[PDB]
Amino acid sequence: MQFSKMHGLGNDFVVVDGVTQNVFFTPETIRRLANRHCGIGFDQLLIVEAPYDPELDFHYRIFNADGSEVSQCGNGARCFARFVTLKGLTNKKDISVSTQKGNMVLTVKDDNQIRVNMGEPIWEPAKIPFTANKFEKNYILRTDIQTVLCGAVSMGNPHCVVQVDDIQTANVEQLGPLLESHERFPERVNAGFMQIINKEHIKLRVYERGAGETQASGSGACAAVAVGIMQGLLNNNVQVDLPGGSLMIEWNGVGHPLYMTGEATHIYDGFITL
């Protein structure tokens, strides 16, 4: 079986052509392949497959090092696009792909960066979903240790965005879990902590819904920028610095879809039996 090793935003991936290859992985096998000393070594495994839908080009699955399938909105998108482009599985510049719990259109930029159309930000509290009497640019959320202000929005998934003075000292450790599992968020939520450097630059940390802090949250990045823009604190093109890497977010506001642009790097090609 053939595979490629890639990296993007602090995560290293094994990417597999599941279209021209028939591939199956047990959680077990995945755990073994992920092992850095006895296996290939990787944070995540990405499998490209047929979409079984005439209006899409591909579908792809993501698995964690534990061996279980995951559905982290937008991650692996850059590696996926670069991969199908490098492997010649397609030659289109605009690629439509489905994810376990989502959908998106990717654009292979001329400079070789990958631009993702994340759709239009969802503000309606009910549609996030988030419990509140009405829309607000800033909501008041109470926790056991502090009352915080936050912007709330949905990029398909739910997000909670809190601004902080210093990204490194933000109380992510305590506030993260408290917001992530907060009562007013029926289906839970992604908790973003954003430090605004200037109108086009932010530093961000995110406590992922049901996963805690990660090196990078694509959707988190989108959400934080959408909120900042909504509140008038940010311009329409913002550089976002996540722990694992940087992303460029572009959003022209209400009535417009939000774009997430970033890089993906091919490291090597591999061959492995079983």
Curated annotation (Swiss-Prot):
EC number of the protein: 5.1.1.7
Entry's localization field: Cytoplasm
Activity regulation information from UniProt: Inhibited by LL-aziridino (LL-AziDAP), DL-aziridino (DL-AziDAP). Also inhibited by (2S,3R,6S)-2,6-diamino-3-fluoropimelate (L,L-3-fluoro-DAP) and (2R,3S,6S)-2,6-diamino-3-fluoropimelate (D,L-3-fluoro-DAP).
Entry keywords, A to Z: Amino-acid biosynthesis, Cytoplasm, Isomerase, Lysine biosynthesis
Reactions catalysed, as given in the entry: (2S,6S)-2,6-diaminopimelate = meso-2,6-diaminopimelate
Pathway: Amino-acid biosynthesis; L-lysine biosynthesis via DAP pathway; DL-2,6-diaminopimelate from LL-2,6-diaminopimelate: step 1/1
Top-level lineage group: Bacteria
One Gene Ontology CC term in the entry: cytosol
GO function term, MF aspect, one: diaminopimelate epimerase activity
GO BP term, pick one: lysine biosynthetic process via diaminopimelate
InterPro entries (UniProt xref): DAP_epimerase_AS, DAP_epimerase_DapF
Residues the record marks as active site: 73 (proton donor), 217 (proton acceptor)
Residues annotated for substrate binding in this entry: 11, 44, 64, 74-75, 157, 190, 208-209, 218-219
Principal subcellular localisation of the protein: cytoplasm
Phosphoprotein in keyword set: no
Site (Important for dimerization): 268
Broad class of enzyme this protein falls into: isomerase
Annotated site residues (Could be important to modulate the pK values of the two catalytic cysteine residues) in this chain: 159, 208
Keyword set includes Cytoplasm: yes
Coiled-coil boundaries: none
Function: Catalyzes the stereoinversion of LL-2,6-diaminopimelate (L,L-DAP) to meso-diaminopimelate (meso-DAP), a precursor of L-lysine and an essential component of the bacterial peptidoglycan. Only accepts DAP isomers with the L configuration.
Family of the protein in this entry: Belongs to the diaminopimelate epimerase family.
Subunit structure: Homodimer (Potential). Previously DapF has been proposed to be a monomer, however it seems that it adopts a dimeric structure.
Protein name: Diaminopimelate epimerase
Species for this entry: Haemophilus influenzae (strain ATCC 51907 / DSM 11121 / KW20 / Rd)
